[PDB]
């Protein structure tokens, strides 16, 4: 394990994103 961890049934598994996850992804742009 843990096979299928970290993938939310109502978001990643539906290819839908929550309202603020883009803020997390943008924080990687630079660093560090």
């Amino acid at each position: 394990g843990e096979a299928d961890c970290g993938l939310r049934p109502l978001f990643e598994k539906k290819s839908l994103e929550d309202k603020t996850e883009r803020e997390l992804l943008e924080s990687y742009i630079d660093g560090r």
Binding site: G1, E2, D4, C5, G6, L7, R8, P9, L10, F11, E12, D18, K19, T20, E21, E23, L24, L25, S27, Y28, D30, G31, R32
Partner: protein
Amino acid sequence: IVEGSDAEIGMSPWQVMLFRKSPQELLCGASLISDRWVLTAAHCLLYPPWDKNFTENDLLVRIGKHSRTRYERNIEKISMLEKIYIHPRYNWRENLDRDIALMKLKKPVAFSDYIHPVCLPDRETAASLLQAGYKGRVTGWGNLKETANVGKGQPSVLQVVNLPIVERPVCKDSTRIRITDNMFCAGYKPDEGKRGDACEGDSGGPFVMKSPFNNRWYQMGIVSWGEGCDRDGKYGFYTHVFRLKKWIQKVIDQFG
């Protein structure tokens, strides 16, 4: 959670509520890491300076919740604890070093739209993502204001806030308390204008990161301690999950 907002439904399906049987009250947060293991902060279970020393039968876990108080019929699941494991070097006397505990459930929970485990980081994932300036996410039903009795400062539903990881020397200079290599801190600096923090009630809850490499959510931190909540020049402190992963795995590999 101070200066966060309402979670969306199913936004944090690994969120667990630790709940006292008598009186009936919320104790802490926690996270689901498999169908029968729950991760939380040691000080939620054992803190002698507050005469706190819970046994398995004092507690429930409530999984799949959104409302703080309403019983969520056909959504939430309630499990009893089979056993509690406190980190054997947990330092409650000084600084809550290694503020981490595992709870084994009496029977496995079934996963659903609202219940799903978070990943724990491997070395590469931790080394890549646990960097100052990167943001993660903290969730809880804890207090809305530094200043739990007061119902105006208790949320109706699960709260969420995103916060950047802070450079270790800044964490260290912010406080007279000794910061160990098994902790990190997060929060906006006063010059960054934005606000937010965990607070009392949020301990045990997860600090999570979404991996840009495989789109999976990883728990990097556990809400552990602070001084006040959301003060300028103060930061929240978190147990460093990757640093204590060997212990987590040891317990799980050994105890079923």
